Amino acid sequence: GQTALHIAIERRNMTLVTLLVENGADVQAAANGDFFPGFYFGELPLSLAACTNQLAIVKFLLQNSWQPADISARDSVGNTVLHALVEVADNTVDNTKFVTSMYNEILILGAKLHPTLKLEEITNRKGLTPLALAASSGKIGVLAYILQREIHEPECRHLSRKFTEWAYGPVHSSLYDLSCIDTCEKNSVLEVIAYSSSETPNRHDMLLVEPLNRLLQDKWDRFVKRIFYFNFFVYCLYMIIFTAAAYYRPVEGLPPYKLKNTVGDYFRVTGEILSVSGGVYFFFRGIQYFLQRRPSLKSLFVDSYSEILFFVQSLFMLVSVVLYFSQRKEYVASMVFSLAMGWTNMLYYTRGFQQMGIYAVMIEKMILRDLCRFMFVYLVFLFGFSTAVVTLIEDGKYNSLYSTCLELFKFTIGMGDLEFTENYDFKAVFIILLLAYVILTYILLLNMLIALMGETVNKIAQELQRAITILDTEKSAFRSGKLLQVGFTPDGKDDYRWCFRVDEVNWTTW
Amino acid sequence: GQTALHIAIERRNMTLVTLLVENGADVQAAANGDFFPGFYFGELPLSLAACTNQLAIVKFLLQNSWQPADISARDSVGNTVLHALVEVADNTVDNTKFVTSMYNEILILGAKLHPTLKLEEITNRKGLTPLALAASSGKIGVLAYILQREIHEPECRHLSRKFTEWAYGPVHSSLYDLSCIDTCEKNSVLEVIAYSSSETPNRHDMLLVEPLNRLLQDKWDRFVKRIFYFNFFVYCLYMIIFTAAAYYRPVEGLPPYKLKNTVGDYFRVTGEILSVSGGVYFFFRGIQYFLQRRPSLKSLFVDSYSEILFFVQSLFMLVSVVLYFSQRKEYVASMVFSLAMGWTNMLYYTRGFQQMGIYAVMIEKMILRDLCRFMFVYLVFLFGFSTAVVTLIEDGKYNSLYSTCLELFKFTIGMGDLEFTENYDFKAVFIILLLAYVILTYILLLNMLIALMGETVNKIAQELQRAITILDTEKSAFRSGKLLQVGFTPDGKDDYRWCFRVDEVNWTTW
Amino acid sequence: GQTALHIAIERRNMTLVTLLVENGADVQAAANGDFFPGFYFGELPLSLAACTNQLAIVKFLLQNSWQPADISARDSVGNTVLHALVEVADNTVDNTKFVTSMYNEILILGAKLHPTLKLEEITNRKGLTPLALAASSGKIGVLAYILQREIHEPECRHLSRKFTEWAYGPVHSSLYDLSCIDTCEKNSVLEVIAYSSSETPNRHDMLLVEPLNRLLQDKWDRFVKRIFYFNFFVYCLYMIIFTAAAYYRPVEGLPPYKLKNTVGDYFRVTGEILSVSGGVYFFFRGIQYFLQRRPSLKSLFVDSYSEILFFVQSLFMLVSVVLYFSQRKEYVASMVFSLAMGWTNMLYYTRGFQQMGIYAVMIEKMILRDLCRFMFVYLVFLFGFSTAVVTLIEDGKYNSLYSTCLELFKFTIGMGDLEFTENYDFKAVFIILLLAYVILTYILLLNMLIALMGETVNKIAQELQRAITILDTEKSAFRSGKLLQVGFTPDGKDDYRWCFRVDEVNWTTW
Amino acid sequence: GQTALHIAIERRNMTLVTLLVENGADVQAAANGDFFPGFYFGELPLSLAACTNQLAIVKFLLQNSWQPADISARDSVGNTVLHALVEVADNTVDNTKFVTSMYNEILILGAKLHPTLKLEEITNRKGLTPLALAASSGKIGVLAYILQREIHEPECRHLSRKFTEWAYGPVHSSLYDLSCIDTCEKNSVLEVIAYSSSETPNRHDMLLVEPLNRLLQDKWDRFVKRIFYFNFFVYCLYMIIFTAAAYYRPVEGLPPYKLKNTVGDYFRVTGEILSVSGGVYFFFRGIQYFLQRRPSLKSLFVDSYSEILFFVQSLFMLVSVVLYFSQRKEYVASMVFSLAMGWTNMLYYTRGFQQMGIYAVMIEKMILRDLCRFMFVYLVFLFGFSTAVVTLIEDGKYNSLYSTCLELFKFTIGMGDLEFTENYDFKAVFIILLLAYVILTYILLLNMLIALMGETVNKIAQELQRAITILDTEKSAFRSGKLLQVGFTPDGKDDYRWCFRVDEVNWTTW
Ligand code: NA
C-alpha cells in the first residue's frame, strides 16, 4: 500500500517531495499494508512526516498551492496526527522531548492556518481524545507536557492551559485547566488512570503530575474525609446490630420463629430485618460494581481483593436467609460465617488513617503471594508423608490416612500429641520420616520469611493508596473549580475553563 | 494598605524610587493589608527591600537627605529588619546564602551609620531576639551563619562572634561567643531547641552546629556525669528500701497498724515513711514539670513518655496511702502496683550508658507505634470471633462470651486448653472458624514484625539522646566560660563575652 | 629456546627486526622453554607480535619477500594466532578493546592475503575452535565481540556475522549467525557455557550476550514449555499410581504374593509393574547422565543436587524389589522410603513456573550451606553435654548415654519431658549444665538465621535458572533458523549461515 | 624555651633565618616548654622545619659554613627528624603526600651529605625504629610509603626497598625488602600490628599493604596449615581420651581409688594421668601467655576471649585434682564441668576452615554485646516482678520469693506450670502483673534481635581473622626469603636484604 511520497518522506529528499508535489500528485490517500514485523504511524504522509523528524516536510504538506493537506483527516482508527503522535511516544528523554516539541509546533501551526477549528477535541472511533489515550496507554511524558502546556505567542494564546493570574515578588499564582481532568463526565483522565487494569507501566508515576495530586488532596479535604468517616461509622453500627441480633438467636427449633409479644422479640425482629437488608444492599452494590467496571479475571485477586470478600459475605448472608425459610438448622452456621467475615472485613477502613500504618502494602506481597504458595507446598508434603507413614503402619488407630495426617499435623505445630511413636516395627524408619517431614516444612517456612524480608528492604529503599480511596469514595460541593477568565478566543468571546488556583513560593530567577 | 513606594521596591525601578524620595515622600509608614494567599515581609519599605534582592534600594533608604529611614523601627509584631530577615529564611542553599549575605551587609551598614546602637539585642513584642526566633522556628542556615559569624573590617570588629586568640603553624585556637547560648537566663538557644515541641523540621540538625555539641560535651564531662550517677544510685537505694518495706507487710488486718516496740517495727515504720516521702516528691516534681513546660497533649506520649510513667506511679503510691488510712485492704494492691511500676521505670537510666545500647530508638517505633495497633486489632478480632463462636454454641460451659473468649485466647498462644473442640453440632464450622481466627491474628503479628525490620534497615542506613539528657540533668561549676578579652567596642572599653576556647588541628591552607 | 627475533619483537626495534628479516633469518621456528614464573603466547614470533602491541611487526612478518610467515601454523597445542589471542584475553576494558581490535585486524589481513583459506574453522589438538575456548575459559569480552562481529569492507564482507536485512525509519531488522551457536553438534557454545563446571568466572554474564538470550527464549516458547509440562504431568501420574499401589499392600506375609483372580489384584500387579519400570528407567537415566557428563565430585552437591536425589530414589526402589524377591519383610520399608522421597523430589518442577517464586536461590544458600553446618555443630554439642550429664548421673534410667541424649534433645525443642531434673545430688550443677546447653544451641541457630538475612539483603540488591532448564529439557521443530542468504563468498557462491531474524525498535541516530 | 630561630622557622622569613645563621647563632639547642594546648615537633629547628613546610630552611640548616646541623641528634625521647616526621603524620591525603615527600627528600639529602651513616636503624629511647612506631601508632600512609619505597638516583639506590629483578613484556617481577618485616626478632612490624591493643585506628587497614598479605599467605601455605591441623587432631584425641576416662569413673567412694590388677584399670589410670597432664599444660601455657603479652583488662573480654576460657577450664581440672586428693566427692562435679567446657571450646578451630563460615564475626557482636545486656535487664525485671507478686500472695507455697520466681520464669518460656493463677484474692491484679512481665521481657528480646539484624546488614555492606591465626600458630622452614642480591652499598660491598620475590601480571603502560 506504500506510495512514492511515503518513501520520499522516509528518505527525506525534500527536493523529490517538492517535485512530486509540484505536479500535484496527492497529499492524503492512505497506507493499508499488513505491515503498516511492522510499524504504525497513522497511514498518512502527514502523520509519517510528523512522526519521523520532519518539520520542513510537514510544513510544506499542511499547506501548498496544488493540494493542501487536511489536518483534520481521520483514518480507519480515526488516528489524527496528534493522536498518532501520542500513540508513537515511547517514554524516553530524547523521544519525549522531540514528540512534545512536534506536538507544540503542529498545534500552533494548525491553529494559525485554521484558527476556527480546534483539533484537541477531535476523538477517535473508540471515542477517546488524544489526552485520554495518553493516559490510558501510560504515556507519562506526553501527559506531563500537555497538562502544564503554555503558549507565549499572540493569536494562539487560547491554546495554552497554564497561566499566571498574578505574580508578586517571590510568590506567584498559576492557574491550571481542569477541563477533562476532574469531571470530563466521559473518560476523565483521573478515572482512566484509576480504572485501567494493573499492566500499564506507570500508573503510579502519572498521578504525581503537578495538578493531579493537589486536586486529589483538595477533593479529599473538601468532602471525602467526611464521607469516609460516615461510611465507617454506619458500617460499625450495622455490625454491632448484627452481632447483637445473632447473639440472642432462639434455640426452640426449625425456623421460622413465631413472634412473641415482648419488647425483646420486637427488637430481635428489627435487628434481623436490618441485617438482611444490609447484606442484600452489599450484594447489589458488588454485582453492579462488577457490571460497570468489568475487570479482568487476573485483576480480581491482585486488585479489588476486598470487594470480592464483601460480595461473598453478602452471599453467605443470603444463603443463610434461604436456609432459614426452608426449615433447616444450618442458617446459624451461615450466619456465623457471615458475621465473622464481616468482622474481618472491617479492616478495609484501616486506610484513610495514616496513624494505623504507612507501609501496609506488604499485605499484598504476603496474604496471597506467600501464604498461598506455602499452604500448597505444605499440603503436598503432608499428603505424601502421611501416605508413606500410614503405609508403614501395621494395624491400630493409625492404619487410616486421616488419623495419621491429623497427628502428623499436630507434631509439626508444637501441640504435639499422645506419643504414638511406639507400638510397631521399623521404629527408626518412622522416627526418621517424622524428622524429615517436620524439618522440611519448617525449612520452607523459614525461606518464605527470608524472602519477605529481603524483598521489603529494597521495596522500601526504592519507592497512591489514597489516590484510589478518594475516587472510590467520590463515586459512592464536588466541583473543584470556579470558572475563571483567561482572556478571549481567536474571536472576541470570554473564555471559561474551570481554572484551579495554585500558588507556589519561589525565591530565585527574578 | 500598599503605597507607591512599596510597588516601586517590588518593581525595582530605582529611578522611580529616587524620584519618589527626591520629593521626600516618606520612608517608614507601614502596610496593614489582610494579604500582608499572602506574603509577609515586615510591612515596611526597609524590610521589603532587604527581603527581595535590594542592596542599592536599602542603602538609599537607610540614609538620605530628605528622610533617613530609621533602622530601629518596630512593627506591630515588633519585626525589625533583622528579625524579618530571619523570619523569611526558607532553608535553601541559594536562599540561605543570600539571606546570610543580606544580614551581614545590613548589620555592618547599620553599625557604620549608627555605631552606638546595637540592633542584635532588639527584641520583638513576644520578647525574643532574632537568634531566638531563628532557633525556635527551625531556621538552620541563619543560626549556623550567626553562631560562627566574623567581621574583618576595622570600626566594626566588635560585631564579630568568632575570633582567633593564637595561631600556631598547623594548630590554631578559636574563641566562640557563648552569650545567649549556654545561659541566656531568658530564652537560651539550647533551651529553645530542646523545649520546642517535636514539629520543628530540624531540631536534631541544629544541635550539631560547631559550638553547641562541644559545649554539651564539656558540660557533661564537667558535672552531669556525676549528677546522673548520683541520681541513679539514690533511686536504686529508694527502690531497695521500698521493696524491703513492702515484703514485710503485716497480715493482721485493716490498717492502720499499731507500733510494737521492736527494732524490726521501727525499721518498717522508717521505710514506710521514706517510701511515702519519695512518692510524694515524685508527684510534686511531675506536676510542677508539667506546669512549667506546658507541653502539647500530642507530645505527651510521643515525647516525655517517662515522666508520665513516674507521675502515675506516684499517683498509685498516694492512692495506696489514702486507702491505708481508711481501713481498707486494697492498700496492698496499690502498693504492689507502684512497686512493680517503679522497678519497670528503672529502665530510664539505661541512657547515659553507651554500653547498654546505641540504637535504643526502636523503643519508640514499637512500644506504641506497633504494640498499640496490634493490641487494638487483635482485641477487635477476638471480640468478633468469640461472639460468633458463642452464638454457634448450644449449651454447656461455653454458651457465655467470657468463657469462650478466655479459651479462644488460650488456643492462639500455644497454652492450648482442654479440648472443647467436641460435644456439639457443626463441628467442621467451629474448626474452620477457629483456624481462621488463629491464622489471621498470627498473620497480623507477622506483618507488624516485617514492617519493623524493613523500617529499621534504612532508619539505620540514613542517620542527640544525650543532648536532652544533659539539659534535663542540668535543670534537676556551671559556667562553661571564662570572660576573655576580645578587644574593645567602637568606644575604648574592654569587651567581655564569655569566650569558649576551642582548638582545631588543621594541616592545609597555610 | 628464545631466539634473537623473539627478543627484538619484545624490544620492538623494528629497525633490528627489518635487518634480521633482510638477511632472511626465519619467521616461524618455535619457542619451547619451560618458562614459555612464566608467560604463554603461542611460542611463535607471529603470535608474540600479535599479543604484545605489534601491528607493524605482524604486518611485516605475515608477508615478506625473504620468508612469508604462514598464518595457519599450528603449535604443540595447536595454538593458532587467533586461538592464542583468545587465550591471552584477561577481561579488562583496555585489554578487551585491544585484543578485539587485534583479532579484527589480523582476520581481515589474513583474508586479504589468503582469501581462499578460512582461519575461523581452525581447531586445536583438543578439537576446539577459538570461539569454543573463549566460551569454555570464560572470556566474556572476546565472545561478545565475535558473536556480533561485522565488517564494512568489500572483498571481506563474508567474514561478518551480523547483518541488516532491511532498515525502516526507526525500526531496523538485523540477522545473526547461529552457526556453532545453537547446534554445533560438536561443542556448541551454549552447551559449553552450560556444562562447564562452576568455577568459570562469568558463566552467568556470558548468557546475556545479545543473540543467546533471545535464542533461549525462542526455543522455550517453541517447544520446551510443552515438553516440560508433559514431563511434569507424566511424573505426577506415575507418583499417583505408585502411591495407590503401595497403599493396598497385602498383609499376608513373606512375598512374593500369589495372584488371586480379581480386578483389584490385576490392577495391583499392573501398578507394581509400572512403578518398578519407572524406577528402573530413572536409575538408567541417572547412570548414563553421570557417564556422559562426568562432573567433578565437588560439583555433585553444589550443582546437579536433584539428579543425585532421583538416582538414590531409584536405588531405594531397586533394593525394595531385590528384598521383595528374597522373602523378606523390609521391602515395605524400602518402598515407603522411595515413595516419600519421590513425593519430596516433586519440587524439581517448581521451576518453569515464575508464579511459584523468582528468588528460590536461597535453597542453595541454606539446605546445605547452613543446615549441614548447624546439624554438625549441634550434634557435637549434644554428644559432649550428654556425656557430661550421664557422667554426673549416679544411677537410674539416665545412667546410660542414649536415654540422657534423647531427653536433652527433648528439652531443647520445647517438647520438654517428664522432669528428671530431680532425684540426684549436685542439683545446681545439672541445672547449670542444662541451661548452658540449651542456650548455646539456640544462640548458634540465631546466628545462622542472622547470617542468612544479612547475606540475602545484598545478594538481592547486587544481582539464568531457565537458561539451564531449557537446555536440559531440549536434551531429554528444533532448528531456530531458516538458512537465509547474506550475499556471496570471495567466490561467487550463495552463502547460507542459519540467520536468526531479530528486529529492534530504535528512535535516534537517523 | 622558644628561641628566635624557632619563631623565624615558624614565620618563614628565610632572610631573617639567613641573617641569624650568618652570625652563626646556633642550629641545635632544644625547646623544653610545657606547651612543647600544645604542639610537638621534636624540640629542634631541624625537626620544626621538616614538619611545617620548609624545604629551603631545612636544606640550609642541615649544612652551612657557620654551624652544620647534625641530622643524627637525639632528643629527650630520642625523636630523630625521621621519627618526628612519623609522629606528626595524621593520615590525610594532603598531609600524607607531604609527609612522604618530606621523608624522601630528607633521607636522600642526608645520605648524599653523609653516605656512611644510616638514619633508618636509628631508634628512640624506648627502643623503636621509625617504621616500628609508624606501625604501633597506626600511621597507615607513612607505613605504606616506606614498605614499597624506591629511589631512582645513583649513589643512593641502596636506600630503596622495592626493585625489579626482571621485566618481561606484560609480566614483571619485583622484589620486596623483608628486613624488619617477617622476623625483626625485636619488634617486627607484623608483631606490633597484631599485639597492639584494639584502640589503634586502622589495625586492619595496615595488614593489606602489598607485601604483608602475600607474606602471610605464603607462611600459611608453607607450614601453618599443617601446624593448625596437627593441633586440632591432637586436641580431639585428648578430648576423646578424657571423655572415655571420665565415663568409667568408679562409684565405690571417697577417692583416691586403689589400683586393681586388670587391663581396664591400667587404661583408666593412664587416661587420668594424660588428662591431668593436658590440663596442667594448658594452665601453664595460659599463664605464660598472659605474662608475655600483658594485655589490658579492657581487652581481655573484647579480644583473646578464648584463651580465658581455656585457662578457666584448666583451673577447673586442677581444682578437680585437688579435691580428688582430699577425700571429697565433688571431684566428679569439677571434672564434668571441665569436660563440658572443653567440648564447648572445641569451637576455636572453626576458624582456619573457610567452609564453616566466612562471616562468623557476629559471635562478638552477640555473645557479649547483647547476651549480657539482655540477661542483666531480664534478671532485674524478674527480681522486681517476683517481689511484687510474692508480696501480693497471701499464704501457701508461693509466699516465698524463690518459689514465685521459679514459676514466673516458667510462664515466660512456654514450659508453663501448674496453674497457680488461682486460690487468692486480687485475681485480676495478679493476671495483669503476669501479662506485663511476660510482654515486657519478650519486647526486650525482640529489640535485641532487631538491633542485631539492622547492624549486620550494613556491617556486611561496608566491609584478617587468619592474619591473627597465622601469627599465633607460628608462635606456638620459617624464613620466607632467600637473601637475594640487589647491587652494592655506597661502598663496593654486596648487599643482602632478604628479598621476597613477587610477580604481577600487567597489560598497560608499556
Ligand atoms: Na507446649
mmCIF file of N, CA, C and O in Angstrom, chain A residues 2 10 12 35-36 39 51-53 88 373 381 384-385 388 391 394 419 426 429 433 446-447 450-451 453 455, chain C residues 166 168 170 246 249 251 329 336-337 340 343-344 347 355-356 359 362-363 366 415 449 453 456 460 507 510:
data_model
loop_
_atom_site.group_PDB
_atom_site.id
_atom_site.type_symbol
_atom_site.label_atom_id
_atom_site.label_comp_id
_atom_site.label_asym_id
_atom_site.label_seq_id
_atom_site.Cartn_x
_atom_site.Cartn_y
_atom_site.Cartn_z
ATOM 1 N N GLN A 2 2.149 1.107 0.145
ATOM 2 C CA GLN A 2 3.042 2.254 0.191
ATOM 3 C C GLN A 2 3.094 2.948 -1.166
ATOM 4 O O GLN A 2 3.018 2.302 -2.215
ATOM 5 N N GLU A 10 10.206 8.996 3.979
ATOM 6 C CA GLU A 10 11.176 8.163 4.684
ATOM 7 C C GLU A 10 12.604 8.507 4.275
ATOM 8 O O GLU A 10 13.495 8.591 5.128
ATOM 9 N N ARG A 12 13.551 11.370 2.935
ATOM 10 C CA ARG A 12 13.757 12.769 3.302
ATOM 11 C C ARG A 12 14.504 13.528 2.210
ATOM 12 O O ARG A 12 15.360 14.366 2.500
ATOM 13 N N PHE A 35 1.853 -4.941 7.056
ATOM 14 C CA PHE A 35 2.994 -4.458 7.828
ATOM 15 C C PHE A 35 2.646 -3.163 8.547
ATOM 16 O O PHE A 35 3.005 -2.975 9.715
ATOM 17 N N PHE A 36 1.951 -2.261 7.864
ATOM 18 C CA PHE A 36 1.616 -0.957 8.416
ATOM 19 C C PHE A 36 0.544 -1.081 9.494
ATOM 20 O O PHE A 36 0.028 -0.077 9.989
ATOM 21 N N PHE A 39 5.188 -1.473 11.677
ATOM 22 C CA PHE A 39 5.405 -0.118 12.180
ATOM 23 C C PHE A 39 4.151 0.688 11.894
ATOM 24 O O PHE A 39 3.690 0.723 10.749
ATOM 25 N N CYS A 51 5.938 12.090 12.570
ATOM 26 C CA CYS A 51 6.410 11.070 13.498
ATOM 27 C C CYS A 51 7.878 10.698 13.321
ATOM 28 O O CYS A 51 8.391 9.906 14.120
ATOM 29 N N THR A 52 8.571 11.230 12.317
ATOM 30 C CA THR A 52 9.893 10.722 11.953
ATOM 31 C C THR A 52 10.870 11.855 11.641
ATOM 32 O O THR A 52 11.638 11.792 10.681
ATOM 33 N N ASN A 53 10.874 12.904 12.466
ATOM 34 C CA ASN A 53 11.804 14.025 12.302
ATOM 35 C C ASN A 53 11.641 14.697 10.937
ATOM 36 O O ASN A 53 12.550 14.713 10.104
ATOM 37 N N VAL A 88 2.748 7.202 19.237
ATOM 38 C CA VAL A 88 4.128 6.842 18.928
ATOM 39 C C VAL A 88 5.068 7.059 20.108
ATOM 40 O O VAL A 88 6.178 6.513 20.111
ATOM 41 N N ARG A 373 1.284 -19.990 48.352
ATOM 42 C CA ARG A 373 2.386 -20.869 47.978
ATOM 43 C C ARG A 373 2.723 -21.832 49.109
ATOM 44 O O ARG A 373 2.834 -23.050 48.900
ATOM 45 N N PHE A 381 3.320 -31.856 50.846
ATOM 46 C CA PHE A 381 4.205 -32.598 51.742
ATOM 47 C C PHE A 381 3.400 -33.431 52.728
ATOM 48 O O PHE A 381 3.714 -34.602 52.983
ATOM 49 N N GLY A 384 1.863 -36.552 51.004
ATOM 50 C CA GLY A 384 2.837 -37.579 50.665
ATOM 51 C C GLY A 384 3.370 -38.302 51.888
ATOM 52 O O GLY A 384 3.370 -39.540 51.949
ATOM 53 N N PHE A 385 3.820 -37.542 52.888
ATOM 54 C CA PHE A 385 4.400 -38.167 54.070
ATOM 55 C C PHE A 385 3.355 -38.930 54.872
ATOM 56 O O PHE A 385 3.666 -39.981 55.442
ATOM 57 N N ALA A 388 2.902 -42.237 53.170
ATOM 58 C CA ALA A 388 4.026 -43.115 53.483
ATOM 59 C C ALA A 388 3.888 -43.698 54.886
ATOM 60 O O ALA A 388 4.034 -44.911 55.090
ATOM 61 N N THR A 391 1.094 -46.200 55.235
ATOM 62 C CA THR A 391 1.516 -47.439 54.594
ATOM 63 C C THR A 391 2.431 -48.237 55.511
ATOM 64 O O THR A 391 2.320 -49.466 55.597
ATOM 65 N N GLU A 394 1.066 -50.903 60.714
ATOM 66 C CA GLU A 394 0.593 -52.280 60.615
ATOM 67 C C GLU A 394 -0.906 -52.378 60.891
ATOM 68 O O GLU A 394 -1.680 -52.777 60.015
ATOM 69 N N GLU A 419 1.996 -39.783 72.414
ATOM 70 C CA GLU A 419 3.126 -40.319 71.666
ATOM 71 C C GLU A 419 2.747 -41.681 71.105
ATOM 72 O O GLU A 419 2.801 -42.696 71.804
ATOM 73 N N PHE A 426 9.931 -51.226 62.716
ATOM 74 C CA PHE A 426 10.601 -50.180 61.942
ATOM 75 C C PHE A 426 10.542 -48.842 62.676
ATOM 76 O O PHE A 426 10.279 -47.794 62.083
ATOM 77 N N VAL A 429 12.764 -46.179 61.257
ATOM 78 C CA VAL A 429 12.256 -45.682 59.981
ATOM 79 C C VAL A 429 11.196 -44.613 60.216
ATOM 80 O O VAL A 429 11.210 -43.544 59.592
ATOM 81 N N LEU A 433 11.369 -40.622 59.197
ATOM 82 C CA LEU A 433 10.385 -39.977 58.333
ATOM 83 C C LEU A 433 9.765 -38.766 59.018
ATOM 84 O O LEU A 433 9.578 -37.710 58.395
ATOM 85 N N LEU A 446 10.792 -20.961 56.813
ATOM 86 C CA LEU A 446 11.917 -20.071 57.049
ATOM 87 C C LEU A 446 12.315 -19.361 55.763
ATOM 88 O O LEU A 446 12.611 -18.159 55.768
ATOM 89 N N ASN A 447 12.287 -20.080 54.636
ATOM 90 C CA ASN A 447 12.572 -19.429 53.361
ATOM 91 C C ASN A 447 11.545 -18.382 52.987
ATOM 92 O O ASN A 447 11.922 -17.308 52.500
ATOM 93 N N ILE A 450 12.415 -15.324 54.943
ATOM 94 C CA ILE A 450 13.645 -14.679 54.493
ATOM 95 C C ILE A 450 13.388 -13.891 53.217
ATOM 96 O O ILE A 450 13.853 -12.752 53.063
ATOM 97 N N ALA A 451 12.657 -14.491 52.275
ATOM 98 C CA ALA A 451 12.336 -13.795 51.035
ATOM 99 C C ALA A 451 11.523 -12.540 51.312
ATOM 100 O O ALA A 451 11.767 -11.486 50.709
ATOM 101 N N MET A 453 11.577 -10.584 53.964
ATOM 102 C CA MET A 453 12.419 -9.514 54.500
ATOM 103 C C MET A 453 13.348 -8.952 53.427
ATOM 104 O O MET A 453 13.514 -7.725 53.301
ATOM 105 N N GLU A 455 12.946 -8.854 50.258
ATOM 106 C CA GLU A 455 12.208 -8.030 49.310
ATOM 107 C C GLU A 455 11.822 -6.693 49.925
ATOM 108 O O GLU A 455 11.931 -5.648 49.270
ATOM 109 N N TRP C 166 16.904 -5.404 6.348
ATOM 110 C CA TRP C 166 16.137 -4.242 5.927
ATOM 111 C C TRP C 166 16.020 -3.278 7.098
ATOM 112 O O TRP C 166 15.757 -3.695 8.229
ATOM 113 N N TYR C 168 14.000 0.274 8.332
ATOM 114 C CA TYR C 168 12.795 1.056 8.054
ATOM 115 C C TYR C 168 12.729 2.150 9.116
ATOM 116 O O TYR C 168 12.367 1.880 10.264
ATOM 117 N N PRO C 170 12.562 4.172 12.026
ATOM 118 C CA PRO C 170 13.021 3.779 13.367
ATOM 119 C C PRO C 170 13.445 2.326 13.436
ATOM 120 O O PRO C 170 14.543 2.002 13.901
ATOM 121 N N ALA C 246 1.024 -48.790 46.509
ATOM 122 C CA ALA C 246 1.648 -49.030 47.803
ATOM 123 C C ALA C 246 0.629 -49.029 48.934
ATOM 124 O O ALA C 246 0.808 -49.742 49.927
ATOM 125 N N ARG C 249 -1.013 -52.561 49.816
ATOM 126 C CA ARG C 249 -0.098 -53.677 50.000
ATOM 127 C C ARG C 249 -0.764 -54.755 50.852
ATOM 128 O O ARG C 249 -1.373 -54.435 51.883
ATOM 129 N N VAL C 251 -1.122 -57.911 53.540
ATOM 130 C CA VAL C 251 -0.549 -58.124 54.862
ATOM 131 C C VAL C 251 -0.416 -59.619 55.177
ATOM 132 O O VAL C 251 -0.196 -59.999 56.324
ATOM 133 N N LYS C 329 10.666 -58.921 54.793
ATOM 134 C CA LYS C 329 9.592 -58.006 55.151
ATOM 135 C C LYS C 329 10.028 -56.547 55.155
ATOM 136 O O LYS C 329 9.259 -55.684 55.587
ATOM 137 N N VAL C 336 8.379 -47.484 51.126
ATOM 138 C CA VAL C 336 7.896 -46.237 51.712
ATOM 139 C C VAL C 336 8.980 -45.169 51.645
ATOM 140 O O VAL C 336 8.691 -43.988 51.413
ATOM 141 N N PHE C 337 10.241 -45.559 51.846
ATOM 142 C CA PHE C 337 11.331 -44.602 51.686
ATOM 143 C C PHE C 337 11.306 -43.990 50.291
ATOM 144 O O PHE C 337 11.331 -42.761 50.133
ATOM 145 N N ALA C 340 8.155 -41.633 49.752
ATOM 146 C CA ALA C 340 8.299 -40.331 50.389
ATOM 147 C C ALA C 340 9.322 -39.478 49.654
ATOM 148 O O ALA C 340 9.109 -38.277 49.442
ATOM 149 N N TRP C 343 7.820 -38.095 46.456
ATOM 150 C CA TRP C 343 6.906 -37.002 46.764
ATOM 151 C C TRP C 343 7.679 -35.731 47.085
ATOM 152 O O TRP C 343 7.255 -34.626 46.723
ATOM 153 N N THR C 344 8.817 -35.867 47.766
ATOM 154 C CA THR C 344 9.664 -34.708 48.030
ATOM 155 C C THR C 344 10.276 -34.169 46.742
ATOM 156 O O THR C 344 10.253 -32.958 46.490
ATOM 157 N N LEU C 347 9.318 -31.396 43.931
ATOM 158 C CA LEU C 347 9.598 -29.963 43.952
ATOM 159 C C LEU C 347 10.446 -29.506 42.772
ATOM 160 O O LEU C 347 10.495 -28.303 42.494
ATOM 161 N N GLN C 355 5.378 -18.052 38.832
ATOM 162 C CA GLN C 355 4.451 -17.699 39.908
ATOM 163 C C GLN C 355 4.902 -18.285 41.239
ATOM 164 O O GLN C 355 4.702 -17.673 42.295
ATOM 165 N N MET C 356 5.505 -19.473 41.208
ATOM 166 C CA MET C 356 5.903 -20.153 42.432
ATOM 167 C C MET C 356 7.053 -19.464 43.153
ATOM 168 O O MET C 356 7.304 -19.782 44.320
ATOM 169 N N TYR C 359 12.935 -15.638 43.431
ATOM 170 C CA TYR C 359 14.141 -15.797 44.241
ATOM 171 C C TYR C 359 14.041 -17.086 45.057
ATOM 172 O O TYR C 359 13.799 -17.082 46.264
ATOM 173 N N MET C 362 17.905 -19.102 47.482
ATOM 174 C CA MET C 362 18.257 -19.306 48.878
ATOM 175 C C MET C 362 18.208 -20.775 49.274
ATOM 176 O O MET C 362 18.839 -21.157 50.268
ATOM 177 N N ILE C 363 17.506 -21.607 48.501
ATOM 178 C CA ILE C 363 17.553 -23.050 48.725
ATOM 179 C C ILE C 363 19.000 -23.518 48.793
ATOM 180 O O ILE C 363 19.376 -24.305 49.667
ATOM 181 N N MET C 366 21.075 -22.346 51.750
ATOM 182 C CA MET C 366 20.594 -22.824 53.079
ATOM 183 C C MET C 366 20.483 -24.336 53.283
ATOM 184 O O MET C 366 20.762 -24.741 54.388
ATOM 185 N N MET C 415 9.303 -29.738 73.340
ATOM 186 C CA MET C 415 8.563 -30.914 73.777
ATOM 187 C C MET C 415 8.709 -31.121 75.275
ATOM 188 O O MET C 415 7.809 -31.677 75.917
ATOM 189 N N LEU C 449 20.571 -17.843 61.285
ATOM 190 C CA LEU C 449 19.492 -17.078 60.662
ATOM 191 C C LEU C 449 19.911 -15.633 60.388
ATOM 192 O O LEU C 449 19.580 -15.070 59.329
ATOM 193 N N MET C 453 19.912 -13.715 56.643
ATOM 194 C CA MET C 453 19.246 -12.466 56.273
ATOM 195 C C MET C 453 20.252 -11.429 55.778
ATOM 196 O O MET C 453 20.023 -10.744 54.765
ATOM 197 N N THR C 456 21.256 -12.296 52.285
ATOM 198 C CA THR C 456 20.207 -12.161 51.287
ATOM 199 C C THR C 456 19.909 -10.711 50.942
ATOM 200 O O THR C 456 19.517 -10.436 49.805
ATOM 201 N N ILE C 460 20.420 -9.676 46.927
ATOM 202 C CA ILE C 460 19.213 -9.293 46.214
ATOM 203 C C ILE C 460 19.229 -7.825 45.801
ATOM 204 O O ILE C 460 18.309 -7.374 45.105
ATOM 205 N N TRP C 507 15.013 4.866 18.102
ATOM 206 C CA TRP C 507 14.428 6.169 17.811
ATOM 207 C C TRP C 507 15.470 7.283 17.868
ATOM 208 O O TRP C 507 15.153 8.416 18.239
ATOM 209 N N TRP C 510 19.564 8.797 13.291
ATOM 210 C CA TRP C 510 18.982 8.584 11.976
ATOM 211 C C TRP C 510 19.795 9.305 10.905
ATOM 212 O O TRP C 510 20.961 9.640 11.118
#
